[PDB]
Motif scaffolding. Structure first.
Motif, PDB file in Angstrom:
ATOM      1  N   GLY A  24       0.763  -1.232   0.000  1.00  0.00           N
ATOM      2  CA  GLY A  24       0.000   0.000   0.000  1.00  0.00           C
ATOM      3  C   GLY A  24       0.800   1.291   0.000  1.00  0.00           C
ATOM      4  O   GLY A  24       0.251   2.345  -0.316  1.00  0.00           O
ATOM      5  N   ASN A  25       2.085   1.230   0.341  1.00  0.00           N
ATOM      6  CA  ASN A  25       2.890   2.444   0.386  1.00  0.00           C
ATOM      7  C   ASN A  25       4.303   2.334  -0.166  1.00  0.00           C
ATOM      8  O   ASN A  25       5.113   3.235   0.037  1.00  0.00           O
ATOM      9  CB  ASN A  25       2.967   2.961   1.823  1.00  0.00           C
ATOM     10  CG  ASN A  25       1.620   3.394   2.358  1.00  0.00           C
ATOM     11  OD1 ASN A  25       0.972   4.281   1.799  1.00  0.00           O
ATOM     12  ND2 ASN A  25       1.187   2.768   3.444  1.00  0.00           N
TER      13      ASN A  25
ATOM     14  N   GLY B 199      -4.767   0.580  -0.149  1.00  0.00           N
ATOM     15  CA  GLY B 199      -4.196   1.639  -0.950  1.00  0.00           C
ATOM     16  C   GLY B 199      -3.375   2.670  -0.198  1.00  0.00           C
ATOM     17  O   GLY B 199      -2.579   3.377  -0.809  1.00  0.00           O
ATOM     18  N   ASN B 200      -3.539   2.760   1.117  1.00  0.00           N
ATOM     19  CA  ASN B 200      -2.803   3.767   1.869  1.00  0.00           C
ATOM     20  C   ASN B 200      -2.161   3.292   3.160  1.00  0.00           C
ATOM     21  O   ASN B 200      -1.227   3.919   3.648  1.00  0.00           O
ATOM     22  CB  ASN B 200      -3.720   4.953   2.193  1.00  0.00           C
ATOM     23  CG  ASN B 200      -4.175   5.698   0.958  1.00  0.00           C
ATOM     24  OD1 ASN B 200      -3.365   6.260   0.222  1.00  0.00           O
ATOM     25  ND2 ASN B 200      -5.480   5.706   0.723  1.00  0.00           N
TER      26      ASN B 200
ATOM     27  N   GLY C 156      -4.096   1.870  -5.765  1.00  0.00           N
ATOM     28  CA  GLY C 156      -2.814   2.345  -5.284  1.00  0.00           C
ATOM     29  C   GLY C 156      -2.818   3.672  -4.546  1.00  0.00           C
ATOM     30  O   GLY C 156      -1.855   3.980  -3.846  1.00  0.00           O
ATOM     31  N   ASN C 157      -3.882   4.459  -4.682  1.00  0.00           N
ATOM     32  CA  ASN C 157      -3.924   5.757  -4.019  1.00  0.00           C
ATOM     33  C   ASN C 157      -5.252   6.146  -3.389  1.00  0.00           C
ATOM     34  O   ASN C 157      -5.437   7.300  -3.012  1.00  0.00           O
ATOM     35  CB  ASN C 157      -3.511   6.854  -5.002  1.00  0.00           C
ATOM     36  CG  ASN C 157      -2.073   6.718  -5.452  1.00  0.00           C
ATOM     37  OD1 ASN C 157      -1.149   6.740  -4.637  1.00  0.00           O
ATOM     38  ND2 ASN C 157      -1.875   6.574  -6.755  1.00  0.00           N
TER      39      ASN C 157
ATOM     40  N   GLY D 103       1.481   0.210  -5.573  1.00  0.00           N
ATOM     41  CA  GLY D 103       1.432   0.870  -4.288  1.00  0.00           C
ATOM     42  C   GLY D 103       1.385   2.386  -4.322  1.00  0.00           C
ATOM     43  O   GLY D 103       0.992   3.005  -3.337  1.00  0.00           O
ATOM     44  N   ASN D 104       1.762   2.997  -5.439  1.00  0.00           N
ATOM     45  CA  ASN D 104       1.774   4.453  -5.497  1.00  0.00           C
ATOM     46  C   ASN D 104       1.176   5.071  -6.747  1.00  0.00           C
ATOM     47  O   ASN D 104       0.786   6.233  -6.731  1.00  0.00           O
ATOM     48  CB  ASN D 104       3.209   4.971  -5.341  1.00  0.00           C
ATOM     49  CG  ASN D 104       3.799   4.667  -3.981  1.00  0.00           C
ATOM     50  OD1 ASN D 104       3.300   5.130  -2.956  1.00  0.00           O
ATOM     51  ND2 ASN D 104       4.868   3.883  -3.965  1.00  0.00           N
TER      52      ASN D 104
HETATM   53 CA   LIG Z   1      -0.710   3.465  -1.996  1.00  0.00          CA
END
Ligand SMILES: [Ca+2]
Ligand SMILES: [Ca+2]
Ligand code: NA
Lengths: 104, 103, 104, 103
Positions: free
Chosen positions: A67-68, B67-68, C67-68, D67-68
């Motif tokens: 996720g990051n 996602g975060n 992803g965000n 992930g981003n």
């Molecule tokens: Ca993310």
């Protein structure tokens, strides 16, 4: 409730019983080796703390996804792409085994 | 189309039929138990509100992915790792089950 | 190369041939309805542009993962959790079909 | 253990054997073609360096997830959506194939 436990017990035995299959054992060892290689690679090339390298390795090989974090170097990106396919290859292997051990 | 509707109803009946199989019930209970455990753990160890702990537990155990969020503590990271394999173990169980009824 | 194309053609026919199965059709329609419900929900409750609501709906229902973005409201979070299980339910349905159409 | 090694070799041979099946070859070629298309598209339409376009294409087509990154343009978002279903279509193909050889 007693049925639940007896079924749970039967199923749990079946699971442990599958831990006797030599091919399942190979897939498993192969998976551990892959996770260790990954942990080593990401900590070395991406400079991640060992525990973070294993985490990224795990969420990546299982398709869970991070996720990051995403590799910052081109070497890491290429590695991650090949890493993912090894993971899919391993999953297919386990699935193939299931399909086979169900039809006999 | 009555046809579409009949086919759907037939499928829904087959689904309800599944929720009657004991092994499916075990797998179902185990995943709910696993989700509850996850919610508890992340609320306590990562300090997430229960609703967010459940969310992370769910997207993690299903391989959907968050996602975060990502665990900040080492205990959390190690737990998440084993948590994922429990999820894979559960999925293989459901899969094996669906490959068993298909005979 | 000619083998490739003839196999590709045979496989493509098999795929389109499966588009004739009424159960596959139901699963498909059920999937589209789910994606539309999701698009409507997220744009309404989370205030996302329709195209972003469909995107989040898609990456969420397929386990790809966003992803965000993650729902900001408790209503959205609860919905997403149930949404994911519907998606898994649908995937199992498709897989069950395969397993059945392979053994006859 | 010679045993472990022999079992592994047996498995590797079975894997190489697969890379000989025409239908597997088609599925393999199709996914590589799909990955190349994705790399091209994201480089051009989203302005990503080819290496990053390949990465996004890969984590997306495999359901791993990024992930981003997430597409910024509408064309990109729509493409990603269809791209995902192509990936699912491909996975079902490999799965069906593995369920066919298991007989
Ligand atoms: Ca993310
Ligand atoms: Ca994912
Ligand atoms: Na996934």
């Amino acid at each position: 409730m007693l049925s639940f436990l007896l079924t749970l017990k039967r199923m749990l035995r079946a699971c442990l019983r599958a831990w006797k299959d030599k091919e399942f054992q190979v897939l498993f060892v192969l998976t551990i080796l892959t996770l260790i290689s990954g942990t080593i690679f990401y900590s070395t090339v991406e400079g991640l703390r060992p525990i973070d390298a294993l985490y990224f390795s795990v969420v990546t090989l299982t398709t869970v996804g991070a996720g990051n974090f995403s590799p910052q170097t081109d070497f890491g990106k290429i590695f991650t792409i090949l890493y993912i396919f090894i993971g899919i290859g391993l999953v297919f292997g386990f699935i193939h085994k299931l399909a086979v051990n169900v039809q006999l």
